[PDB]
Amino acid sequence: ASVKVAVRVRPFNSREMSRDSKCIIQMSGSTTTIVNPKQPKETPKSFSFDYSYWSHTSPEDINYASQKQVYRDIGEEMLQHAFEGYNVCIFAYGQTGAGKSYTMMGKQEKDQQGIIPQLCEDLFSRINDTTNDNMSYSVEVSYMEIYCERVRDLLNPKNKGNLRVREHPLLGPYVEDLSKLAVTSYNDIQDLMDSGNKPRTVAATNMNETSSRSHAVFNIIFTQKRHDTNITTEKVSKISLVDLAGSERADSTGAKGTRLKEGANINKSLTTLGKVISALAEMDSGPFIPYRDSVLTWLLRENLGGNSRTAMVAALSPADINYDETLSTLRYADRAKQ
Template sequence: MASSSVKVAVRVRPFNSREMNRGAKCVIQMQDKSTCECNTHSDVFFFHFISSFFCLRCEDPSFASQRKVYQDIGEEMLLHAFEGYNVCIFAYGQTGAGKSYTMMGKQDPGQQGIIPQMCEDLFRQTADNTDPDLSFSVEVSYMEIYCERVRDLLNPKSRGALRVREHPIMGPYVEDLSKMAVTNYSDIADLMDTGNKARTVAATNMNETSSRSHAVFTILFTQRRHDNMTSLDTEKVSKISLVDLAGSERADSSGAKGMRLKEGANINKSLTTLGKVISALADMHGTKKRRSDFIPYRDSVLTWLLRENLGGNSRTAMIAALSPADINYEEILSTLRYADRAKQIKCNAVINEDPNARLVRELKEEVNRLKELLLSQGLSNLITASGKYTHTHANLLTARLYSLLNNSQMSVQQCWRSYFHDRVS
């Protein structure tokens, strides 16, 4: 089990027309890659994150492009997916702060966000595979959480909300959610386009195309390998969750009325619950309290579905999207404090491998210790002059260990000791 903190980055977008028309001033400074400073005339606040992306002016030498953001955040998460871990990236911030642009972006060259870049990179790496014993499969789903109801964005004509269920082993899932098999980037790009067109958006004073729902794009990435040494077929499955949260907002700033006001109330309710979950998980750091005793995951659909990504079996990154303008100072500071709490969350990710894969890995780890054990018993004749095990002996050892495991209740270590005792007696 690999314990790791949630990786938190911040990104500041350029001024928009509304802010420029009001003569807004910049209250955000980034002194280096990881330090973000928020200041007014009377107060200065410093925050430290894993990355700080300054996108105020494209001519600035420190300007962070879409590619730069993906390279710093997305590439590492994709690597973890290939290792067999669940991964999650989610964007948080006030409405109009640049979350959807960061996660999905635009179709114009150089404007693609993390989601399309990761999908393209995933298929590029699988296409580069030359191992005949390794194969891949990819399935995707795309849903939105709108007013605490789940909609299938890949089947937008379906009526009624989908139900969230609890699997005793796999955890929360959405019943009857479409899951589409894809074989190349073109397939997945078409599905993204279908889902994006079906998302619920509306104009507010803060944003002409404000996302009124939380969107979750999920990739189920399966790696299958045939191990010639043991003749076993093994499998690793990684769930990649890419989340574009709806924008936090104040009714007086967004000008929300009627349906927009109701939407905003539901958005703020789920984000408030997310904040409570983050605070509770952050407070667990250094304590021995059990997570299940007091974390309010089920208080909203969003936090229920993200349960494993928040303090559970996942490698998780958060991108806090910020406006640079002094007229949004309260929202900026709230987002930075939110993000500062999130980086204290500890996740306990495990490689999602089947029992056969775990068995093969453990056996190979034992084989890799063979040299030292043989040398310690004066059996160096079983090692080649190059210091490696002979292929024959490695195969025999693994086969013998597997045979012992398959026909007894012994652990790998007990089987090794039994095998080694047979060899030296």
């Protein structure tokens, strides 16, 4: 498939604990139902996706959907496509606190590594098994945040907030002066995003709370070079893993505490991405897009191409108090494919 969509509900969080929240999410197979806390006497509204991940309990539960599961379904498939020579893209979408970061990066602790860590590990693991002595590989990485059309290099503490995206007359869009580092091992790449991840939540990020109102993009350019007598062949694929800004922040009217240039940019970004993805889906059903409408869809143009593969995971809170924005996330994920 050219587009894949999954939704994932998490355990109650602290806010939901204090409010004595009831669970309004249910799942069976690839289907998720959502109840209206006001009309609990109703028939839940249903939605179907490629995957409906029930992660509301804990790994102690036999039917808890774990980080390894989510990854073997979505991540593994994408990395395989990447070895074929094609670009891929994984997006985590949802309201602030729903589970986007946990799904993408997760926790360094045993058992909770997100999709990025597992994908990087799987990548070097497959690479190190290459017995063919006529095989050469290169892995370059970039880690950045997109805030109000401005890019912050997460891999370099001495040039942030200011980077701007450009468009090469022939090569495509690119961030000027963005660090792109060649890594030769997993322990190495594991340091870069550990380093990039802390940059995401240092005390200073709470000024504009860029942790939840910016898009975090982890890019990996994977080059494969084959040797045969004589020409050497080269396959280069781009992999973009993204932790989108919060969906409830898509408001550009002042609610609630979110600034105009902030939500405007976020609404525009999530809306455009929605058009691009559904557009890619209508396309793959039968068997040019407004990427310029947002810095995010513009920078990732080549990953949302024609032979590109994309997957999205929409994170969902299970709480009654988040019905509105959770319904809103189901619809958004629903439109992306349907």
